[PDB]
Write a protein that binds this ligand. Structure first.
Ligand SMILES: CC(=O)N[C@H]1[C@H](O[C@H]2[C@H](O)[C@@H](NC(C)=O)[C@@H](OP(=O)(O)OP(=O)(O)OCC[C@H](C)CC/C=C(/C)CC/C=C(/C)CCC=C(C)C)O[C@@H]2CO)O[C@H](CO)[C@@H](O[C@@H]2O[C@H](CO[C@H]3O[C@H](CO)[C@@H](O)[C@H](O[C@H]4O[C@H](CO)[C@@H](O)[C@H](O)[C@@H]4O)[C@@H]3O)[C@@H](O)[C@H](O[C@H]3O[C@H](CO)[C@@H](O)[C@H](O)[C@@H]3O[C@H]3O[C@H](CO)[C@@H](O)[C@H](O)[C@@H]3O[C@H]3O[C@H](CO)[C@@H](O)[C@H](O[C@H]4O[C@H](CO)[C@@H](O)[C@H](O[C@H]5O[C@H](CO)[C@@H](O)[C@H](O)[C@H]5O[C@H]5O[C@H](CO)[C@@H](O)[C@H](O)[C@H]5O)[C@H]4O)[C@@H]3O)[C@@H]2O)[C@@H]1O
Ligand SMILES: CCCCC/C=C\C/C=C\CCCCCCCC(=O)O[C@H](COC(=O)CCCCCCCCCCCCCCC)COP(=O)([O-])OCC[N+](C)(C)C
Ligand SMILES: CCCCC/C=C\C/C=C\CCCCCCCC(=O)O[C@H](COC(=O)CCCCCCCCCCCCCCC)COP(=O)([O-])OCC[N+](C)(C)C
Ligand SMILES: CCCCCCCCCCCCCCCCCCCC(=O)O[C@H](COC(=O)CCCCCCCCCCCCCC)COP(=O)(O)OCCN
Ligand SMILES: CCCCCCCCCCCCCCCCCCCC(=O)O[C@H](COC(=O)CCCCCCCCCCCCCC)COP(=O)(O)OCCN
Ligand SMILES: *C(=O)c1ccc(-c2c3ccc(=[N+](C)C)cc-3oc3cc(N(C)C)ccc23)c(C(=O)[O-])c1
Ligand SMILES: [Mn+2]
Lengths: 131, 109, 6, 61, 33, 41, 376, 56
C-alpha cells in the first residue's frame, strides 16, 4: 500500500516549505509574477522592499530552503547510503565518509550564503551577510 | 454471530467481576452514575425547560466526570501501567476526583 | 504590529 | 559515573543562569534607553485594570 | 545607570557564554554516552 | 448585577434537583473510597 | 522540559537557548509590553509539557496538571482555542494510525473532563465549550474515544480478523453522522457558528467582504518571505529538516509535533499576528535537528574522521554565534522602540495627554479615533 | 495496629476536604477556602501517603 513514512514525510515537509516561503501571500495578495530591470532583465526579487514580493520569489526560496533541508537530512541519515552507491568498492570507508560529510557541510555553507545575499537584496543594510 | 459474542463476553465479564471483588464496586458505581444522569435528563424533558443551565450542567458533568475517572481507574487497575503502581493510581484518582467535586460545587453557584 | 488602523 | 552526573547537574545550573541573563538583558533595551513606561495600545488598558485590582479588591475587580 | 552600548555588550556576552556552555554539554554528553 | 446578587441555588426548585444529584454523588464517592481501602480482594 | 520529553536533555538545552533570544518571541515580550501574550505563550508550553508527559506515561495526575494549566490559559488569553483543537487532533490521529492504548483513554478523558468543566467558569467563556463549533472537535474525540475503548473489550472476545473491518465500517458511520449532526444543529441554530476570525483564516478574502474593521488592523495580514527570516534566522531552514527527521521515527510525541508544525506554518503564513504561536515549535524542531547532527559529529570516540567532525561541528557553531549576533541586532533595531515617545525626543503625545489631564474638567468626554482610546 | 491511626488520618483528610467545599458552597470566601485547604492538606498529605505506603 501507499502508507509509507517517506511519502507522508516528504509531502509534509514540502507543504511546510511552501508556507514558510510566503506561498499564501502570492494568492491572497495578487503579485506580478516577476519584473523587468533597466535592461529588460527579469528581476526576480523586488528590491529594497520588505513587505512586497514577486511570485518567482516563492519558487526561488523554495529551492533554497529545500536544498538546505535536504542537505541536513542527507548529513544525518544518508551518508552511508551514498557511500554504498557512489563508491561500492568499499576498499576504504572512513576516509570516503569524511570526504562526503565535509562536502555536505561546504554546500550547506554555500547555500546559506546565497540565502543571506538574497535577503540583503530585500533589505539592503543587513549587517551580517555571510559572504 | 452477534448473539454468540454476547454470551462469550457476558461469561468473560462475570468471570472477571467474581474473581476480583473490587472490579465489581467500580462497576456498580458506574452503573448508578448512568442512572443519575438519565434522571436529570428526564427531568429536563418532563418540564421542557432548562432555566438553571449552570446548575443543570454542574449536575450532569459531575456524573460524566466521575464515570470517566472510574473507568480510568479500572483500566489502570486491571493491568497496571509501566511506571504507575496500583497505589499511586488510586491516589491520583482521589486528587482528580476532589478537583472535579470542587469545580462542580462552584459551577452550580 | 499593534491593534491600530493601517 | 557519579562524577559525570554531578558535573552535568552543575553545568545545567550554570547554563540556566546564563539563559536567564541572556533573556532579561535582551529585553531591557527600551527600559535602559528611555524610561520604564508601558508601551503599545492594549497594555495601557491592562495597566489600568491592574491598578484597579491592586487599589480596590479582587471582588470589586 | 548602564549605558546602551554596555547593555548591548552584556546581551551579546551572555548569549555567547550560553551557546558555548551548551555546545560543551552536548560534546561531553555525546562522547560519554 | 454582580456575581453574588443572583438568587442562590437553594431557592430554585430545578436547582433543588441538581443539588440533590451533586450531594448523592459526593456521598457515594466517600463511601466508595472507604470501601475500596477496607475490602480485601 | 518539553523538548526533554521528545528527544533528550541536550536537545532540551538547545531549545531553551534558542527560545530565550529568538526575535520572534522577543517581539511580543519586550519589557514594557503588557498584553496577554506575555504570560500566555508561557502557559502554552507548560500545558503542552504536561500533556505529553500525560500521554506517553498514561497518568491521571499529569493529565490533571495539564487540565489546570489549560484552565490558567483559558483565564489568561483568548487563543486558548488553539489548545482546544490541537490536543484532540493529536488524539484523533493516534486513533487512525492504529496506536490506541489505555494510556490514551485515561489521559484524554481526564484532561477533557476537568479542563472543560473548569474553562466554563470564566465569565467571558460562559457556555461556549458545549455550544460552539470551535470547541466541538474536543467533544467529538470525547465521544469517539469511548466507542474505541469498548472496541478493545470487544476486540478480544471475537478473537478473529472478522473484527477488522467490523471496526472500520463502524468508525466511518459515526464519523459521518457527527459532522451531519453538527451541520444540522448549526442550521437549526442550537450550536453557534464558527467565530468571525477563525473562518477568516480559511476564507482569506472574507474579512474585507463583510467585517470592515478586521481588514483595517495591520496585525491580520499575510506575511512576505523575508519576515520568516528576520525573526528566526538560521532556524527557519533547519526547522523543515527537523520535521522530516521526526517523521522518519514516528512516536506519539512526534505525531504531536508534526501536527503542530503543519497547522502553525499555514496559520503563520496566512496571518502575521499568528507568527508568535509558530516560534516555539520552530525552536523545538531546530533543537532536534541540530542535536541529531551533533550526536553524529561531536562524540570524539583517525585523521579523516577527526577532520570531518571538526569541520561540520565548527560550521554549525559558527551559525550559532551568528544567531546570537543577528538576534541581538534585530531586537535592538526594530522591537525595542517605545510608542509614546518617538526618537528624534518627540514628546507630543504625552504633552497633550497631560494637558488634558491637568487643565480639563474631570468629567469631560474626549472624542477621538478608536486607535488612541486606551492611551487617553 | 498503628496503621489504624494513619487510616483515620486518611479518612479525616478525605472527608475534610469535602467539608471545606461545602463550607464554600454556603458562603465563605475563596481566600478562607484557600487557607483552610492548605492547613488541612499538609498534615493530610503526610498521613495519607503514610497510610497508603503501609497498606497495599
Ligand atoms: C474585531 C474583533 O475581534 N472585535 C471583538 C473585540 O476584539 C478585540 C479584543 O477585545 C481586544 N482585547 C483587549 C483586551 O482590548 C483586542 O485584541 P487582540 O489583540 O486580538 O487580543 P486577543 O483577542 O486575546 O487575541 C486573539 C488570539 C487569537 C484568537 C489566536 C488564534 C490562534 C490560533 C492558532 C487559531 C486557533 C483557532 C483555530 C480554530 C485553529 C485550531 C486548529 C484547528 C481547528 C485544526 O482587539 C480585538 C480586536 O481589535 O472584542 C470584543 C469583546 O472584548 C468583541 O465584542 C463582543 O462580541 C460579543 C459576541 O458578538 C457576537 O455575538 C452577539 C450575540 O451574543 C451578536 O450580537 C454579535 O453581532 C454583532 O456583530 C456582528 C458582526 O460585527 C453584527 O453584524 C451585528 O449586527 C452585531 O453588531 C456577534 O455576532 C458580544 O456579545 C459582546 O457584546 C456584549 O458585551 C457588551 C459589554 O459592554 C454588552 O454591551 C452587550 O450587551 C453584550 O453583552 C452580553 O454579553 C456579555 C458577555 O459577553 C455580558 O456581560 C452581558 O451581560 C450581555 O449578556 C447578556 O446578553 C446575552 C445575549 O444578549 C446573554 O447571552 C447573556 O446571558 C448569559 O450571560 C449571563 C451573565 O453572564 C448569564 O446570567 C446568563 O445565564 C442566565 O440565563 C440563562 C438563560 O435563561 C440561564 O440558562 C442561566 O441559568 C442563567 O444563569 C443566571 O441565573 C442563575 C440563577 O437563575 C445564576 O445562578 C447564574 O449565576 C446566572 O448567570 C447567560 O445566558 C446576558 O443575558 C461584544 O460585542 C468584538 O467583536
Ligand atoms: C537566575 C539568576 C538570574 C541571573 C541574572 C538575571 C538578571 C541579570 C541580567 C541583567 C541585569 C541588567 C543590569 C541592569 C541594572 C541597571 C542598574 C545599574 O547598572 O547600576 C549601576 C551599578 O552597577 C554596579 O555597580 C553593580 C553592583 C555590584 C553588585 C554585585 C552583584 C549583584 C548582587 C545581586 C543579588 C545579591 C543578593 C544575594 C542574596 C540574595 C550604576 O547605577 P547608578 O550609577 O545609577 O548608581 C547610583 C549612584 N551610586 C553609585 C552612588 C549609588
Ligand atoms: C485537592 C483539592 C483542590 C481543589 C481544587 C482547586 C483548584 C481547581 C481550579 C479551578 C477553579 C475554578 C474556578 C475558580 C474561581 C475562583 C474565583 C472566585 O472565587 O471568584 C468567585 C466568582 O468569580 C468568578 O467566577 C471569577 C472567574 C474565575 C477567575 C479566576 C482568576 C483567574 C486566575 C487564574 C490563576 C490564578 C493564579 C494567581 C497566581 C498564580 C467569587 O468568589 P467569592 O469570594 O464570592 O466566594 C464566595 C463563595 N460563593 C461562590 C458561594 C459565593
Ligand atoms: C490555578 C487556578 C487557581 C484558582 C484560584 C483563584 C484564586 C485567585 C487568587 C488571587 C487573588 C489576588 O489577586 O490576590 C490579591 C492579593 O492577595 C491576597 O490577598 C490573598 C493572598 C493570595 C493567596 C492565594 C494564592 C493564589 C494561588 C492559587 C493556587 C491555587 C491552585 C491550587 C492547586 C487579592 O487580595 P485582595 O486585595 O482582594 O484582598 C481583599 C480580601 N478581602
Ligand atoms: C491536519 C493534519 C496535519 C498533520 C499531518 C498529518 C500527519 C499524518 C500522520 C500519518 C503518518 C503515517 O505515516 O501513517 C502511517 C500509517 O497510518 C495509517 O494507517 C494511515 C494514517 C492516516 C492519517 C493520514 C493523515 C490524514 C490527514 C492528512 C490530509 C487531510 C486533508 C484535510 C484537509 C504510519 O506508518 P507506520 O509504518 O510507522 O505505522 C505502522 C504500520 N506498519
Ligand atoms: C508593526 O506594525 C511594526 C513593528 C515594527 C516596525 C519597525 C520599527 C518601528 C519603530 C521604530 N522606531 C520608531 C525606532 C523602528 C522600527 O524598525 C523596523 C525595522 C524593520 N526592518 C529592519 C525590516 C522592520 C520593522 C521595523 C514597524 C515599521 O515601522 O515598519 C511596524
Ligand atoms: Mn492584544
Amino acid at each position: 500500500i501507499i502508507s509509507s513514512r517517506i511519502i507522508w514525510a516528504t509531502l509534509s515537509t514540502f507543504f511546510i516549505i511552501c508556507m514558510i516561503s510566503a506561498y499564501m501571500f502570492n494568492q491572497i495578495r495578487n503579485t506580478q509574477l516577476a519584473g523587468v530591470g533597466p535592461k529588460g532583465e527579469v528581476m526576480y526579487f523586488l528590491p529594497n522592499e520588505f513587505q512586497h514580493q514577486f511570485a518567482i520569489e516563492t519558487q526561488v526560496m523554495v529551492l533554497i530552503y529545500g536544498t538546505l533541508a535536504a542537505l541536513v537530512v542527507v548529513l544525518v541519515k544518508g551518508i552511508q547510503f551514498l557511500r554504498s552507491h557512489l563508491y561500492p568498492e568499499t576498499k576504504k570507508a572512513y576516509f570516503i565518509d569524511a570526504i562526503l560529510a565535509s562536502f555536505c557541510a561546504l554546500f550547506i555553507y554555500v547555500f546559506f550564503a546565497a540565502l543571506t545575499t538574497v535577503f540583503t537584496i530585500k533589505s539592503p543594510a543587513y549587517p551580517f551577510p555571510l559572504l | 454471530d452477534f448473539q454468540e459474542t454476547f454470551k462469550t463476553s457476558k461469561r468473560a465479564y462475570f468471570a472477571q467481576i467474581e474473581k476480583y471483588p473490587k472490579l465489581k464496586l467500580i462497576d456498580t458505581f458506574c452503573f448508578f452514575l448512568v442512572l443519575l444522569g438519565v434522571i436529570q435528563c428526564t427531568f429536563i424533558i418532563l418540564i421542557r425547560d432548562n432555566f438553571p443551565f449552570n446548575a443543570f450542567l454542574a449536575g450532569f458533568i459531575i456524573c460524566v466526570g466521575q464515570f470517566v475517572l472510574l473507568m480510568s481507574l479500572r483500566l489502570q487497575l486491571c493491568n497496571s501501567f509501566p511506571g504507575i503502581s496500583k497505589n499511586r493510581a488510586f491516589a491520583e484518582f482521589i486528587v482528580a476526583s476532589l478537583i472535579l467535586h470542587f469545580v462542580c460545587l462552584h459551577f452550580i453557584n | 504590529y499593534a491593534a491600530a488602523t493601517s | 559515573s557519579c562524577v559525570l552526573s554531578v558535573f552535568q547537574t552543575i553545568l545545567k545550573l550554570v547554563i540556566f543562569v546564563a539563559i536567564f541573563g541572556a533573556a532579561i538583558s535582551s529585553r531591557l533595551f527600551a527600559v535602559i534607553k528611555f524610561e520604564s513606561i508601558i508601551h503599545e495600545f492594549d497594555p495601557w488598558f491592562n495597566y489600568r485594570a491592574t491598578k484597579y485590582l491592586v487599589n480596590n479588591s479582587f471582588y470589586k475587580f | 545607570m548602564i549605558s546602551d552600548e554596555q547593555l548591548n555588550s552584556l546581551a551579546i556576552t551572555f548569549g555567547i557564554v550560553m551557546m558555548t556552555l551548551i555546545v560543551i554539554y552536548h560534546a561531553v554528553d555525546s562522547t560519554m554516552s | 448585577l454582580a456575581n453574588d446578587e443572583y438568587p442562590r441555588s437553594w431557592e430554585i426548585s430545578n436547582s433543588w434537583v441538581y443539588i440533590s444529584a451533586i450531594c448523592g454523588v459526593i456521598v457515594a464517592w466517600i463511601f466508595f473510597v472507604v470501601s475500596f481501602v477496607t475490602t480485601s480482594s | 522540559e518539553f523538548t526533554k520529553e521528545i528527544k533528550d536533555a541536550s536537545a532540551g538545552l538547545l531549545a531553551a537557548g534558542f527560545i530565550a533570544i529568538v526575535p520572534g518571541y522577543i517581539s511580543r515580550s519586550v519589557a514594557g509590553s503588557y498584553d496577554n501574550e506575555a504570560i500566555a505563550i508561557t502557559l502554552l508550553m507548560v500545558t503542552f509539557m504536561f500533556w505529553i508527559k500525560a500521554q506517553k506515561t498514561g497518568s491521571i495526575m499529569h493529565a490533571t496538571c495539564a487540565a489546570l494549566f489549560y484552565f490558567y490559559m483559558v483565564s489568561a488569553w483568548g487563543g486558548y482555542v488553539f489548545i482546544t483543537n490541537l490536543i484532540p487532533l493529536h488524539v484523533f490521529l493516534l486513533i487512525l494510525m492504529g496506536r490506541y492504548s489505555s494510556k490514551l483513554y485515561s489521559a484524554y478523558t481526564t484532561w477533557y473532563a476537568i479542563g472543560t468543566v473548569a474553562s466554563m467558569q470564566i465569565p467571558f467563556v460562559g457556555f461556549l465549550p458545549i455550544r460552539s463549533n470551535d470547541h466541538m472537535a474536543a467533544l467529538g474525540v470525547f465521544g469517539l474515544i469511548q466507542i474505541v475503548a469498548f472496541g478493545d473489550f470487544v476486540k478480544g472476545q471475537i478473537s478473529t480478523a472478522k473484527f477488522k473491518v467490523i471496526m472500520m465500517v463502524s468508525l466511518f458511520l459515526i464519523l459521518v453522522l457527527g459532522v451531519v449532526g453538527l451541520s444540522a444543529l448549526t442550521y437549526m441554530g442550537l450550536i453557534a457558528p464558527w467565530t468571525g476570525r477563525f473562518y477568516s483564516l480559511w476564507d482569506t478574502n472574507y474579512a474585507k467582504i463583510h467585517i470592515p474593521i478586521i481588514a483595517s488592523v495591520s496585525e491580520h495580514q499575510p506575511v512576505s518571505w523575508p519576515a520568516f527570516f528576520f525573526d528566526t534566522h538560521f532556524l527557519i531552514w533547519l526547522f523543515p529538516a527537523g520535521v522530516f527527521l521526526l517523521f522518519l521515527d514516528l512516536k506519539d510525541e512526534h505525531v504531536f509535533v508534526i501536527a503542530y508544525s503543519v497547522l502553525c506554518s499555514y496559520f503563520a503564513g496566512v496571518m502575521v499576528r499568528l507568527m508568535l504561536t509558530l516560534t516555539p515549535v520552530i525552536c523545538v524542531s531546530a533543537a532536534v535537528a541540530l542535536s541529531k547532527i551533533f550526536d553524529i559529529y561531536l562524540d570524539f570516540k583517525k585523521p579523516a574522521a577527526l577532520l570531518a567532525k571538526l569541520i561540520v561541528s565548527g560550521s554549525f557553531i559558527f551559525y550559532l554565534y551568528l544567531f546570537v549576533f543577528h538576534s541581538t541586532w534585530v531586537t535592538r533595531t526594530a522591537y525595542s522602540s517605545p510608542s509614546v515617545v518617538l526618537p528624534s525626543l518627540i514628546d507630543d503625545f504625552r504633552e497633550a495627554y497631560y494637558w488634558l489631564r491637568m487643565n480639563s474638567d474631570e468629567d469631560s468626554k474626549v472624542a477621538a479615533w478608536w486607535d488612541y482610546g486606551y492611551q487617553i | 495496629g498503628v496503621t489504624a491511626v494513619y487510616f483515620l488520618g486518611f479518612i479525616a483528610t478525605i472527608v475534610g476536604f469535602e467539608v471545606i467545599f461545602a463550607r464554600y458552597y454556603l458562603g465563605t470566601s475563596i481566600f478562607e477556602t484557600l487557607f483552610s485547604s492548605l492547613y488541612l492538606g499538609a498534615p493530610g498529605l503526610l498521613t495519607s501517603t503514610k497510610f497508603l505506603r503501609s497498606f497495599g
